[PDB]
Amino acid sequence: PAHDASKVRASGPGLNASGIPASLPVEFTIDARDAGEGLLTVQILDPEGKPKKANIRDNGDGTYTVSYLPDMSGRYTITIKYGGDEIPYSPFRIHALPTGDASKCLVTVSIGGHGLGACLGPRIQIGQETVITVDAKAAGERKVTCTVSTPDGAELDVDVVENHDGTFDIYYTAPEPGKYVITIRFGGEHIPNSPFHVLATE
Amino acid sequence: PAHDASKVRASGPGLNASGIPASLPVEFTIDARDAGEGLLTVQILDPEGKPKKANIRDNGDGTYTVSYLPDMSGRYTITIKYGGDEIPYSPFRIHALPTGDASKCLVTVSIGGHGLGACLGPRIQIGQETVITVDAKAAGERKVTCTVSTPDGAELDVDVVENHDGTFDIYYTAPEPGKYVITIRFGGEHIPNSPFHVLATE
């Protein structure tokens, strides 16, 4: 069977034209029920112009659930193709909006049970876990995100434990030697002392 | 049973009022052979008014060898008494002069086998050694020194190990609870983020 990308429809929170909350995971739906047979592709550039992971779930019914994490405030450009052809209204230009005051976050770092206060590196040890606790109690209802730029150039969404008392815990261990950037945002915006530049060594 | 402090003679590199290099230990000699019987005392005030230890070796022949460490830039005041009476030209005012660039020194902290980067404090555990390594390779020809202000009210010279590759290791264990100030200088001047304020707890 053929495909007809002009019949593909997009909807849902992750494409909201009025903007989306930065720091919150979001979903949107792609409906290709009238579009024939083809692969759905989704490519996202983040506000710093870098690629961002788009998770595509095929619902087995002609529809797809697409999820991404807008960690940083700004414009996300989402290019969507079906069967190799760009769908109507792609590329989508989605504005992740900040709320709250990231600058009210307080950060404490711990290594091996030793508290460092708001301080990390410059040098850290491969294989040694760092624990970064962010106190967002005063900052607003949004979340803390942690994005790590590794020496090979990848970008990692580090899991952030939400304790539900306005605090967040970040556990990260550097596995390879070289330079890392640990970017910690609240509601889309850097918290104080973010980003942490560090060098991981034996 | 008497003494005459006016007959005591003093001389030597640690009394060089033209100037001495900060960060380097120095000695001087006291000749009390013509001064009768009495106890020799030497008080040293650093340029901020804090007492510094003067080590007095009684040579058993009416002479004494005295040493001290001028860790900080500025004028030291050296009060010398024999039999409780001040000797001539006391107090001696000895200017320790800075050299080099302490801003080029780099700090690494280690506690309990864990490297903590440049991060010292806010809290440390009583009886747990801290190792502070200062990389002074780019700072010039002088030495790193360390003084600790103890909750005692006392002001201690902490011995610094010179590795002769441009780095220096400071080992320090807080013996008692309370607030400590750890001052680290190079060639008389604070390295970056000195002084370090830490609280020792159980």
UniProtKB/Swiss-Prot annotation, chains A, B:
Filamin repeat start and end residues: 1-96, 101-200
PTM section of the record: Ubiquitinated by FBXL22, leading to proteasomal degradation.
Subcellular location: Cytoplasm; Membrane; Cytoplasm, Cytoskeleton; Cytoplasm, Myofibril, Sarcomere, Z line
Top-level taxon of origin: Eukaryota
TM spans (from-to): none
Tissue specificity as recorded in UniProt: Highly expressed in striated muscles. Weakly expressed in thyroid, fetal brain, fetal lung, retina, spinal cord and bone marrow. Not expressed in testis, pancreas, adrenal gland, placenta, liver and kidney.
Stated consequence of mutating residue 5 to T: In CMH26; increased actin aggregation; localized in perinuclear region of cytoplasm
Miscellaneous: Silenced in MKN28 and MKN74 gastric cancer cell lines due to aberrant methylation of the gene.
Assembly and binders: Homodimer; the filamin repeat 24 and the second hinge domain are important for dimer formation. Interacts with FLNB, INPPL1, ITGB1A, KCND2, MYOT, MYOZ1 and MYOZ3. Interacts with sarcoglycans SGCD and SGCG. Interacts (via filament repeats 17-18, 20-21 and 24) with USP25 (isoform USP25m only). Interacts with FBLIM1. Interacts with XIRP1; this interaction is mediated by filamin 20 repeat. Interacts with KY. Interacts with IGFN1. Interacts with MICALL2. Interacts with ANK3. Interacts with SYNPO2.
Family from the record: Belongs to the filamin family.
Functional note: Muscle-specific filamin, which plays a central role in sarcomere assembly and organization. Critical for normal myogenesis, it probably functions as a large actin-cross-linking protein with structural functions at the Z lines in muscle cells. May be involved in reorganizing the actin cytoskeleton in response to signaling events.
Annotated disease: Myopathy, myofibrillar, 5: A form of myofibrillar myopathy, a group of chronic neuromuscular disorders characterized at ultrastructural level by disintegration of the sarcomeric Z disk and myofibrils, and replacement of the normal myofibrillar markings by small dense granules, or larger hyaline masses, or amorphous material. MFM5 is characterized by onset in adulthood, clinical features of a limb-girdle myopathy, and focal myofibrillar destruction.
Name of the protein in its database record: Filamin-C
Organism per entry: Homo sapiens (Human)
Lineage: Eukaryota, Metazoa, Chordata, Craniata, Vertebrata
Annotated gene: FLNC
Portion of the full-length sequence here: 1535 to 1736 of 2725
